């Protein structure tokens, strides 16, 4: 069933739906989920959601199409900016706490880290390490303080870092970056002070093959390095590190088989997510048993902010790639995702399952219908529809789950009833149609399943009692509430019920009772000058009347013959009999050979 | 329909080593991943092992870490689970299912679509 | 279905018995049944009828010598034969009152296994 975390997320989904269906302007998913890390005690989920929130606060699609946005350059600039800022504030908190101001914070961390070195020290601390680590926190004004103090062994770095903090894309003049590269490989690369090389690297986008394992030991640090290093400008084509190349690099090294095997999923996920690719992150994180719900709800959050490149066609993969994108990212088969998440607790606690189901509403299907409907129509039938799912009629509809977030339920009811109808679960669909206030459909459906049993004898362990009570309750509700159905179907229904009672009395053994019943039906000959109209009466009789006329006529003939043998009146009786013969003598409708055989046999025998 | 045969079970004794096999019936397993689960009366289903589509690396369950081995032979279209140092609880029917989702190495039952029928095993201590 | 009738045998002039029949295969609470007989030397002749809840019916020669009894609680029917006459000598049938017609005039044959009802 559910876990406390699962039911917690669930309740929150309830709340978001009660928001969107009420017409309130509310905080979107990401906000609720963010706060839903301190309602229950945790440590990591909080961090994941922090990352998600910070990474989704972007200018949302400065275009008209999601693909355009998620492949435009400026969009990726926004992504990398948000990402960098998150990493940097993260590391800032990490040090600021683990050390137990900023300018001396980094200083103390250096002192509690490490006690050839280029360009000496200031205040007794090596300048290059100071510069690097104080940039690492995303604070340049401290680096500005340093380069104001430390200014006597540089002066190219001075204006370098100046025009670094002058363009908001952190890009220098082209020739500036080029002379930085030229000085780097010519006097800087071959040095024994790595830190200086790392600083010149990030500040000048140099040597995109270096990883600096010594100073950026941590995977998070590695992300910092490469993202601080990536470039969208085209300066040389040999140190141009393209963000798509980095996404491919990470997808290579991290994930696609390495995710589940390394038993540190949260961190891997933050990696795969900070790199401007959401789909392939959730798709992995969704697989591990520990972090199913967190992945699924990150996906829902993303979808609600319309930040998702979902699968347009229908396939059998969760994460898919359609060989048309420039690079894009693997598309996420959103529908299959919701399905393969709900199916765990769908057939046990469907109340909450229906809640997730709602989100697929505007996502069409193969047939041309909302997938949401073709989803409910399975849950509600294979989990034995209750009133809590739809409701119970009397003359008044009981509110159900589907009511609480959708108006005009009659739509959903008609749909699911038709679906269960095609499925061959007919009786249940009759009940549903009745819960929908649609008389013609209820009655036409009951017609079929009523037709064949109307002459089957009492037969203990049958359906007759059940369907009889069903149709009787139908009659009560409809004739009492003044509900009237289509004439040619209402008529056939009431004829079928009167015939039910007639045959009950017949089987029971009341001759004259059933006889006046069959008289007052005008289905069979009563006078030799009316049989010509009897022949005209049908050609409007549906298959129902056909599928029993045989036994109707047979039973009637039985009544007549019993009266005759048990009996002047026999003239009238046998005249009615030969009229019946003439009737059967010209029926195009259903019969059997033995039907007319017994008919004419009893006829000539009573003669 | 692409069915499966999940065979190699039987009754064995404690501390022995059992080789459970599975053979695909009607497809080429080079895109899919493979998974060996077990059905006990303890639960309805649990996880044992799952191997990716490259035949290189696999995830082992919550308790069985460091006692089993799994492999897939694309050239033989077979799935192999060889065990060591069994436990009384392992009297169970082991299933071998297929992963198409084309991502990761799932460890939850529902993620897989097709199945064989199972191979029953019974350890007698 | 099945209609077994028993409780017969040669009985003395003016004897008495209670013919039993077991109703199984149809709800014997909403089906009217009946008793017929065919003799070794004579044809089929209706003797008894009764509805689910309605009244009864008997031939002119069998009134006061037989008696209906539909033990519906047990889905069993009986016919209490008394002070008999040497013309009921026949095999009996606990049949359905509504099929009595098709059986009576040699049209169709009974579905009951019968019982030996012979009187001196």
Residue numbers in the entry:
A (entry chain A): 177 to 276, 289 to 303, 308 to 426, 430 to 588, 591 to 764, 781 to 820
B (entry chain B): 3 to 127
C (entry chain C): 3 to 122
What did the original publication write about this model?
Nucleocytoplasmic transport proceeds through NE-embedded nuclear pore complexes. With a molecular mass of around 120 MDa and an outer diameter of ~120 nm in higher eukaryotes, NPCs are among the cells’ largest protein complexes.
The tracking nanobody xNup93-Nb2t binds to a C-terminal region of the Xenopus Nup93 α-solenoid, it is frog-specific and did not inhibit NPC assembly. However, the alignment of our structure with recent cryo-EM maps of the NPC revealed that xhNup93-Nb4i clashes with a Nup205 molecule from a neighboring Nup93·Nup205 heterodimer, which would plausibly explain a failed assembly of the cytoplasmic ring. We describe an anti-Nup93 inhibitory nanobody that prevents the incorporation of Nup358 and the Nup214·88·62 complex, indicating a specific arrest in the assembly of the cytoplasmic ring. The inhibitory anti-Nup93 nanobody imposed a late block that impairs assembly of the cytoplasmic double-ring, as well as the cytoplasmic appendices.
